[PDB]
Every structure is written in structure tokens, then in C-alpha cells.
Amino acid sequence: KERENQNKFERSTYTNNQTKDKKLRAGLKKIDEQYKKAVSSAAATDYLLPESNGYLEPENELEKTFKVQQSEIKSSVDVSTANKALDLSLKEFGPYHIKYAKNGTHLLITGRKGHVASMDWRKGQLRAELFLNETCHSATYLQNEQYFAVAQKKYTFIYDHEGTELHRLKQHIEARHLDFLPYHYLLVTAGETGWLKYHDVSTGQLVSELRTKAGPTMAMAQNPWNAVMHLGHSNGTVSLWSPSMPEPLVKLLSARGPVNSIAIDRSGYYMATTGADRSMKIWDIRNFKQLHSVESLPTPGTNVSISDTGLLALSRGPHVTLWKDALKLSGDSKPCFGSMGGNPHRNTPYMSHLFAGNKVENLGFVPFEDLLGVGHQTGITNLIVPGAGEANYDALELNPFETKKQRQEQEVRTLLNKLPADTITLDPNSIGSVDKRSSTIRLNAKDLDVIEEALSRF
Amino acid sequence: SKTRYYLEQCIPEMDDLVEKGLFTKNEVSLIMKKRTDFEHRLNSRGSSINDYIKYINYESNVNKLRAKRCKRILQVKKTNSLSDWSIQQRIGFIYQRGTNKFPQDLKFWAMYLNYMKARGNQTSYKKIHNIYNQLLKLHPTNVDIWISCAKYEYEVHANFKSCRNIFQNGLRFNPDVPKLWYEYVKFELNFITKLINRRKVMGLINALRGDIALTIFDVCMKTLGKHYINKHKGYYAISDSKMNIELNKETLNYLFSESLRYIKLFDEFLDLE
Amino acid sequence: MKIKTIKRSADDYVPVKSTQESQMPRNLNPELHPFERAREYTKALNATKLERMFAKPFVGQLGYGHRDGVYAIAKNYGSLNKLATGSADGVIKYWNMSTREEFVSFKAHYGLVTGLCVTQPRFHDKKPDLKSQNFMLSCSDDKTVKLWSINVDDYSNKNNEEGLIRTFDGESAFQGIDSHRENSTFATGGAKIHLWDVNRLKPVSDLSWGADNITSLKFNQNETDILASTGSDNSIVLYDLRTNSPTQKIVQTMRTNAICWNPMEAFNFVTANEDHNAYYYDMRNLSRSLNVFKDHVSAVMDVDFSPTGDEIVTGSYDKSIRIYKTNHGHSREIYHTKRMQHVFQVKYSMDSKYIISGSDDGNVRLWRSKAWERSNVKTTREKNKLEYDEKLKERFRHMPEIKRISRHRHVPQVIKKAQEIKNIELSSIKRREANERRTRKDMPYISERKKQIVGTVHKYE
Amino acid sequence: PIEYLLFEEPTGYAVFKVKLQQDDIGSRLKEVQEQINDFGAFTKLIELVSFAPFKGAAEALENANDISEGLVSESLKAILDLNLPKASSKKKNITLAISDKNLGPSIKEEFPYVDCISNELAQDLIRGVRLHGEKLFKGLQSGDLERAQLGLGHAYSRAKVKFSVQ
Amino acid sequence: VRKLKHHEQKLLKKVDFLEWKQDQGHRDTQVMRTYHIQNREDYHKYNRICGDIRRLANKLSLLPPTDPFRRKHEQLLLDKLYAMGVLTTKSKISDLENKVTVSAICRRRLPVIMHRLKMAETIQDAVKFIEQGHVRVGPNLINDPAYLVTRNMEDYVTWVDNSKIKKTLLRYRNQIDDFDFS
Amino acid sequence: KYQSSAVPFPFENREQYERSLRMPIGQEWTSRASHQELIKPRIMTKPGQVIDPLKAPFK
RNA sequence: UUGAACAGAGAGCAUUUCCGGCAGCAGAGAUUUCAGCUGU
What we know:
Chain A: U3 small nucleolar RNA-associated protein 7
Shape of chain F: extended
Largest sheet of chain E: 3 strands, antiparallel
Keywords: ribosome assembly, 90S to pre-40S transition, cryo-EM, Dhr1, ribosome
Chain B: U3 small nucleolar RNA-associated protein 6
Shape of chain E: flat
Strand content of chain F: under 5%
PDB class: ribosome
Radius of gyration of chain F: 18 Å
Helix content of chain E: 40-55%
Entry title: Cryo-EM structure of 90S small subunit preribosomes in transition states (State C)
Structural class of chain E: mainly alpha
Radius of gyration of chain E: 23 Å
Oligomer: part of a larger assembly
């Protein structure tokens, strides 16, 4: 009943800053008993969890972890993971924006010149290779490998599984950043116009057009927790947006200069933003505190990414550098680059790699595996990062081994339980409650000159 | 899914089995992933009684390892907590599930009965009675189950009334195999021999005869003759009197050969008259 | 340097043999499953919409009805599918509700058959053959109570002189009848309420409070020796058969059309009366109703309890029936039909799943108590989905978007217009009593549950 | 309540135990009428508790004639006395569902504590187990049921017509 | 996407992954499958032209019917749209909303007039021939199919000489002169 | 419109009412046993047999 | 409606009546488990 890992499974509630009703008293007592039983029994599943997370540990004081080479990892790990660590050398079209499907089964690469390829990177099956000879910028899958949206010269296009064009969106005028919201079925679009557009993929209907009013959108990320969009502008300002409010939900002053990249944890708690002022900044999202401010990077961080197990992958051109346990509150988790004299209270890099020829275009962790796919000027490279993936997925949220029938039925079922775009709030648990107006107690309709003293009476 | 239900029914015993400091978390996760494999193979499609049997063998092996580790770590022979009966209860439930799914392999039914009998004082003889009742309901014609049921309830419990009831019900169902007749006359001779030997013993310390065996001998001859004349010449009596007398002669040969075997294994009961 | 990656191994996740299903590993982290309020809000909304499209409650009418409108119905409380109905032209019929067809019809009387019930007649010379004969008895305004037997094909044990085994006789007319659930006894109300047993051809006892007639009668179902009756002086009288006497009566504002006792609580009953609502009364304290079920718009003609004791059905003179949860006090459901006129009798079948209504065009109709509920047997996946959806609609019940959908029905034009003028009338009298209370000194706050009792014999202390 | 079910067939006798009652009032509805066609829901109603197979085609023909003319044979007596609980004869008999309204009297003549039902509910329960057949029996009979049906039909017909091969 | 069940057709009806509201019935896709347009955005760079001429025809309708600036510019626009052959006659200014079509401004393209005067036999083979570089309008070769013609140049659509399909049709009719090198 | 207008009847304040709503009963968020305990209804009848009135041990 | 003896079912409910403690010893089945006497 005690369960040393309950507070992961606990659930916050409302507080005022007991009752005389017998029936209501016993009803609330049954509700508290059921909540305790449910938390305990849900937290006892960690016995049933099949796999264990990966790691790499130094076992010596001369053996630092950032100086461990990718060939040495590929020798030290098994043949299946060594074959997952792919490398495509696609030289002639431009730097390749990488994208993985939400289970790690499909890869979607876009060249800057025109070359968009959707493929099953772990078999050898490509299912779309289309050369759209205008400058493409980004792409994403929608709810499947079966549809993907590409952001072209101006218009965003939507292609089916084999690459036939389904849609040319006449809105979404100049996208540079696309991201799909999978529980809400919303393709979110931002770019050189100062506008943020939410487009419902299922109905086909443009849900929202929002003026950023801050020029072109330099970075864009999605909170996986509550589906609000963090856009980074040329002010050094991140703004958190929802498709209901025509104003940003929050505006944070992250950096000086512009904001080069944003990444959010999948728990929706931490956000790493890199500015062009050579400054990485780790942010608390829920309480909006600034946790860490790594200033004076040697060159501006062009990308950040956060794995499912909380690694932090920063990329500064040729270099990729990953820190472990950097998204924590304490000042001993501030990511350093060296430990001055061997200080154990300095978060040196967990591992680093140098793409010596080129400058990396973007970063993306492969979802349920221990790999980091970085797309760069001459194609794709996966890196075996051992701490970097949820070993125990849930197979009824999203399954890496899913079949054709399972894809069909899961598509219909998630389409059926698509969440409305109005339910996107800054916290997800605020659509069962009562108003923050409409008084917290329910109402019971019962509650619904001594002369002048004489001259008074006149 | 129901594999999820069974797998999370398995968790309180390993709660207790980690608290009693004999197993660790990394090895109990290994026994849970093996048990996950087995539960999924059990309640998925295309299932096999060999999947049931291998699950029972795995659960008995982890029970023996648990007993060995308990004696080596805690130096007691049972912790008198949940984790010393839960796994035998699991084996009994795997047996019950398997016999409800494939009630056709008497090898598995008899492995169930053997494990349930050999469980010892912890089981209940009415729990053995229940699975004898449903097995005899499903296989009334298979006669070795009747012999085994009555043999368990006479040669272990010495319950003469219930043993007589079992033999009379079996002879009601299949009064055609002579083996059940011979085991009934064997049981009646054993019962009357134990009766007269307890008489001799109470005499030496301090009416009811083999005529029961003779009467069941008489109805054995009559009904075995009737069932052989009904079994051979099967559909109709379309046979002339040559074939009818040939048949009746052959049933006399059959029945008299069985009575020859009756006297041949009747001579060795030499403690009564 | 030690090193370990994720080894997925493909034997645990995609099965070896093709005949068996794939493994579904679970991981109960809320990080893995993010939108836990919105996702089950949308499942509760899709459950309310699925209920509003699956609501097909009309099963079928049974037989061809009667000729002159059904004024009496009685289920038998031991068999599931048998039903006796009588009309205004004196014909009674016994029904198999499985095949929806009459076992037998009977020209029983000449007037209206004003009551009928069913019996297991405890004769002490003969033995009742209840596996092949059913027994219904029935009183009319031609001063007769007649007892009939029915040949029933429900067991195949046997292989016969069906109708009218005896004829009780009164000097004045009868108006209601109900049978005791043991000991050969019944009671008939009329010009005066008499008790009878099936052996004697005359009333055992006359149990009348005063010289005011009796319009309806119900025996209790447990504590079977407690009777209740409705008299046309707006009176509800309780009788006890140990003391062989009346017990206590109350006088209300308007006339109680019917009673039914709670089969699970043994001292609670529900009255159905002419101001358009029903009253849930405790026998041990008749000074206050313990519920009022309000949503009808004309005089409530008949009420009945679910055999689970948890909800009531209530048919009224506006041509519609209404089902009420017992703890709420407003209608959970309304059933209407352009063909159904003036539902005079409603029973709740012993399955607790179907509702029998007898209208006055002639027809007796089956309905589902839960409209969206089908009567097949269910695999565990669909049974689990259905009770998950019930719990989810229950805990999101009061959200405005799903409340406006679950609250929605199509009511006829006449009932809708009477409903809205009833609303503006009630709002006007609340406005005027608020003004009068603002001025005057001592205006007592009378409860709604007491606002309909004009008085009570044997006062409470 | 339709508690037990007796299905006669050429391989022997089967006693099933009714788990869930089907609907009585909604017995003519569409879902109730096609749940006996779906096997995944019929196995929620019916469970096999006993099957006594015959001793051969001779006892098969004897029991086919006894079932045909509505009599309880000795194998019927054995399996019913094994399977049905010793209920009372005056209060709450055990309920057996048959398909033959003139076999019912022969069953109550032998077991007075058994009331027998063959109305439309027992009829469609019986035709559910006829529709599915070999799947309900879980593998416990020798001999294919249609092959025994061919043999028993030919034997019954030649007996009824007195077919002589002379 | 799954040909949804009935409680499915009812619960969500406006879902359609294939055809949205703003597709306008996929008329761009339909007319470029008809007249076989190579790249995208040609439809909309014709539709902008159609919208511009109906907008300035609207504001020429706005101006009063007496001034020579208005009447000279509408007769000039009508004569230029006749001179590029978008129209077939010099009729009413109501035809500048009834008869100007993105279809007809595709009718003036070079492969479709080629199929019209039977130089090719299908528009696809016309685009084959003019990507292979066989034809010319007057002196100069035409490589792209986006060159639409004017009303004067439907007479000098001819192949080049040394075009071997021209040589094959000459040796078909065995009028094949070879002093003129084709 | 995704949050209720006032506090519904059986509760007295929104702390009580949101303590009712604080745990999801879904398959995805509870174990299988806890999911079954949370979704079984209060009134469980048998689908084809008669419900008789209650009888108590001597009232 | 009760009482009596008889035949039972495994389908319910208590509670300190004993056992799931240790040997010595013979017995039981295939070197492991199984079955009772004298005291802790």
C-alpha cells in the first residue's frame, strides 16, 4: 500500500485556500478510498513494466562520458541497434529537416531544394520519394505515416501515403514550422508571416488564425502535455498560444536577440530555449520560473531537443551535445562544458559528437528507441544515445509494432475521440471544474449642538 | 484484456516476496516477464495444453526456488505470509482453467488430480470431490476414472458407503466393460476381507458374506451376456437360425472365458471362506 | 565503460505463431497518457450522443388490442411474460408477451371491467395446478367478481375447463381489486371496501372508514397484510389485516388515482393523483411526502414501481408516460406516440426492463425502460464498454454541453405548450408570493412536500 | 429460469447448464433472435456439463427409437440421474429444457422433481446448440456427428420400413 | 477512410478527408487534368487575370457612359482580348463576365491549339512533342507549354524542319522532298 | 462551456466536487482491477429471471 | 404448522477445539515428499 513511486501517479486537486451531511460524508469517504486504491494499484504496475531504460556509466575516473565515440558505441551495443543507427548520404539537395512519426516507425526527410522522402527507416521500405522542385522547408506526419504535410515555397501541401498530392492549402501563406497535435487532429502552422494557424485535418476546416504581431516566427514547439504552442520571436520572447484566445496565453522574455529553438519536455514541466545571444535557458513551464541560464555558449545553439527520458540535446552547428539530468531545479544541474578541477557538482555533457563537415539542420529523438536523429547538410545520421528513449511504451496509445488492421481501427477510434480545439488550456485539468467566478459555495436559495438637538423633529 | 487482470493479480505475492527479503526487484521482474509470456499464450487464440503444462512446470520451478531461497536466506521453512501458498493456488487455478478449456485430455485431468492429492493437508478432499464430480460428468464412459475415484475414496479414506455408490453409478453408466465388474467384485471382496479381519483382530485382542460378490457376479453374467448379444448383431436381427445359434454360442464362450478369469483371480483372496 | 541500450528483441512484441494475438504492453504513466480530463469528457459526450441516437424504446404493441380502450392491467408476480388486460366493453384477455399474443379472451362482464388481478387460489379442498393453469379474477360495475382459470403452455409435464370457476357477488358495484400475496385473500373496493377469500362466496369483513366510497386498492408486497386505498373524498386510507381494521387516513387536495407500494422498502408507497404529480409517502409518517414527482401536465392516471424499487413509471391523462428516478423528483424519460391516447394503466414488468402501458384507443404497448438498452446477451468487451459509458455519463452529468443533450426529448405540441404556460404561471406566482412575503409579517415557509396534505387523522407528535 | 438443457444427438446425450437466461419478453426482437446465430454470444448462454456417448450403433438405434416415440431410455435415466440435482417434488422443481413436449411426461414419470419446458425459449436454445454443434462439445466425442447422423438415419429408416436384405 | 458505420455516419457527418469546402469542387485539378498543365499555380495565375479583367470591367461599368476615356478603354480591352483570341468575337461587355473563363485562357495555350488543328492527336502527345522541341511559331522554337498564342499566330504553328516526324509524314504521303533538307 | 456553471447538488463546495472528479476511471489510467471496480454499476440484475420483492428474517 | 429418526449437500456462519513448532522411532510411495505415538 505504501508504493515508493506513487507521486508520479498522484493527481492534484482544488483546495479552499468536515461536513454535517451523512450521505455526502460517506460518499466523499468512498471517493477518497477509491482514489487511494486507484493510485496504489496503478503504481504497482512498475513490476509489470517489461524493459529497462538504457544508460552508459563511466566505471572509472579517467573515463569521461562525453569523449565516448559513436563507433565505440556501435561496437559495444547489439547488431539490431547498430543497424538502427543509420546514415543516409544525400548530397545534392539541401540540408535535410528530419521528422519521425510519433511511434518511431517512419522517417520523413525534406531537402531544402526539393527532396521529400517518407520511408520506413528500420526496414528498407520507402513509400514516398517526391521531388518538389521549389524550396521546401519542413514537414510532419499527420496522424499516421499515411498522410504528411510539407511546407513548400509558399503554400503548405498535404500528401497521402504514396505521395499523391491531396491538398494545397490556400491559407498558411508562408509556413516554416509545422507541427501536428495528435489528440486534437490539428495541423499548426507558423512562419515568415506573423501568423499562427490551426487547421483541423479531419474536417478540413481552418480553426484559428492568430496574429503573433511580432514578425516572423523564429522557433516553434508544442507542449505535449497541454497542446499549447510555444513560439519564439525576434524579440527574445517566447509566447504560449491556444486556438481559443486571440492573444497569447503567456509571454515570456526568454533571451536577448531572437529565439533560435524551443523544446518542451513530454511531462510539460520544462522548456529549453536557445537564443541567438549564445544563451541556453531552462524554464519551468507550470510556475514560469527560470531554472537555468547557460550564457556564453561558444556559438549560438541552433537546435534543442528533449528526449522522453529527459535528456537535453543542444546543437551548435557542427556539434551535438547532450546533457543528462539538466532539467532539474538545483544549481548543480546547470549544464556545464567542463568540470573545473573535477567538481562532481557540475553537469558536464552526457555525450557529444562533432559533424565535422557540416552544420546540422535539426534534431529529433527517435521516440521509443535509444537514438537521436540529426538531419544536416548531407542527409541523415542517427546517433546511439543510450539514455534517450522510453523503454516501456504503452501499446494502446501508440505502438511501434502496429499492423495494418491496428492502424485502421486506431485511426477510426482516435478520430472518434478527437478533442475539440476549445479544450486547449494552459492546464489540462480545468475542464471538469466550475468557473472561477460563480461562488465556490453552492447556494441554497435561502441566501438567494444643544439647540439643534431641540430643533430635531423639524 | 484478461492477461492484464491475471498479471496484476500476481502482484501482491511479489509485494510480499520482496518485503520478505528473499527475492530482489530485478529478478522478480524477470519472473514477471516469463509469467507475462505464459499468461498471454494461455488466454490468447491458438492455445495449447502444452502451454498450460509448461506454465505449471515454470510455476512449480519458481516455487521450489522460492522454498530453497527461503531456507537459505531467512532460515525458516515458511514465512507464514502470502508468498508460500499463492503460487500453489496459482498452479491450481492454471489447472482449473486448462481443464475448463480443453476437457478432453485425461493426461491433464490426471495431472490435476495428482497435484491436488499430493498438495497434502493444505488441500480439501471436497475440493478433490468437486473435480472428480465434473470429470466423471464429462467422461462417464471412460471407466478408469470411476476406478480411480473409488480407489482414492477407499484406499485412502476408507469410505465404504461412498465407494459402493461410485461403483454402482459407474455400473449404471457403462454396464458393458468387464473391467468395472471385476474391480467391483475386487472391492467387495476387499471390504468383506477387512470386515472379517477386524473381527479376527478384535477376537485376538479382546451373516454378512461373499454373497454380495456372488450377487454382483450373477448380474455381471446376465448383463454382460445381454450387452454382448446386443453389441454383436448390431442393427437388426436379420440373420437365420444358424447365425442366431452361432451368436448365442459365441456369447456363451465370451461370458465363460470372463468367468474363467474371475476364478483365476478369485483364488488369491484366501482369508474368507 | 559499461553501456546498455534498449533491446526490444521482437519475440515479446510480435508473436511467433500467426494464430495468436499481439502483446499489448501497458505503461500507466500520466506522461504517456496526457489529456485525461478532455479524453473522457469527449467519451462521455459521445456516450450521450450515442444514447440519444440509440433511444428506440417502442418494442411493439401486443395482439390487436381491445375494442374499447384498456382500463385494467395486471401482471402476475411470479411469471415473467404473462399479462392480463381488461377493457371498457367487459372483455378481459390473458397475454403471452413473448409471442405478443393472447392465451385466451373472455367476455367477462357487461359493464366496464373496473379491476382485475391474478391469484394462486389457496383452496383447501382442491390443489392449485399452477404449472398449467393461471388464475385471474376481475370485478366490474355489474356487481360481480369472477375468477377465471387459463390454460398455459409453459411446462410440458402433463398430457381442460378454462373459464369461470366461481362467481362472487356483491349488492353494489365494485371499483378496484387486489389480491393478497398469500392465504387465498383479496380485497375489492367500490361503494365500500370488502375483504374476501376464494372459498367463501361472501365478504369476510367490511373494512370501511366512513360512508364514502373507495376508488382504488393495492396490497403491500412485503408485509403483505397492509392494504391501502383511495377514496373519492380525496382520501388515502391504510388498512391492517392483523387488526382487521383501518389504520390511518390522510386527506389531500385532489383525488388519488392510484397507489403502488415499494417492493424493496415495504413501508413506502407512491400515490398518483389529479394535480399533475406523484407523491412518495412513508407509511410511518404521512404528514409529509418524501418525494414529489412533478413533470406531468395533466392528471396522473397510474403509477408503478420497478421491481428493483429504484424507479417508477407514471402514465397520465396527457397522452404520455414518464419514468422517474426515485431520488430525484423530475422525469428521467418521457414516452409518447401520436397513436397513444390517454394512458390509463401502466405496469413495470418483472424483468425491470420493459414497461407495459394500456391506453384508451384499445392498445397495450411494450416499451423499454432504458430506451438505448438492447436485450441481447453481451460479450465482456461490449458489457465493459456500456458500463464504462454509464459511469462516464454519470460523472460528467452536469456539464452544460452534455446536459443539454441528455435532457433533450421531443414532446408533443400540446404538452410543450402546456409546459411553457405552466412555467410562466409558476414563475408569476413565485413573483407574487415573493412580493407578499416582502411586505407581510408572518408568512410560514411551507415545504413542497407538505403543500398537498390538507389533513391527517391520528396526529403526529 | 431454464436451468438445464437436454440435447439428444446420434453420438449420445448431452446435458448443458444454462448460464444466462435469454430474454423472455424481448424474445422476438432482432438482437435476441440473432444472438443464437453469433457463437461469441451463444457461449455466454450455454455451457456443457455432461456428455454420455453411446455404446455403438445398436444402442444408438435403440435410443433413436425411444427418443422418437417419446420414452426415457436407460442411458437417459443414467445421465439425468447423474446430472440433475435432487430438487423437491412439491416446491421449486429443477427445470430441464427439452425439445419434445411428449418426452416431458416420460421424464417427470421417472424424476418427479423435474419440470420440463419446451416452449419457444427452450426451442431456440435447442436450435442454438443444434446450429453450433461440434463447437460446444470442446472436442469430447469420438466420431464425426454428421457421419453418425448418416448411419443413424439409414438404420432408423430401414428399421421403420422393415427393410429385409433377403 | 473506413466507410463508417451508421451510428458513425450520424455521429460525424461533416468529416471528409478528400474534398473540403475551399476546394471549390477541385476545379483547378479538373481543368489541369483536362488541358494537361505541367506545373501547379498556372491555374491561379490565370484566375488572377480573370479577376483583374472582371474588376476593371466592373469599374469601367462604374464610370458614366459618356466619357471617351471609359469608352476608349473598354473598346481597347475588348479588342486586345479578341487579339489574344481569348474571345471568339467582339460582342457585349457582359461577355467579360459570362465568357471569359480560365478554361478559355487555357484554350489559347499552345498544346491545345495543336490538338485543335490536329497537329498532334492528343494534348499529352502535344506536350511530348513540344518538350522534345519540334514546333515553332514563326521563326523561333517553343520549349515550354506555357506559351499561349495570339489570334495572329494560329497560322504559323508549324514544326521545325529536320523534325523527323515531319519527315515521316512527308514520306507517308511520299511528297518527301529532300532538297529542302527535310 | 467545458466547466460547469455552479456546484451541482449533492456537494457543498467545489473542493468536494473536484475531489470527486480528480481521478480518471479510464482503462489507460487505472489498472484493470481498479477499472472494473470503478465501472461496475450499483444495480446489477440478472437478464432473464423474475425479481421478487424483498423478504427479511422475521421483518 | 411442528417433532422424530434416517439419508445427505458443499451451497452458507462462528471461535480459540486442534494442526500448518522440534526431535526419537517405526510405517508410505517414487534420494525427495508422505503418514502417528512421548515431551519441549
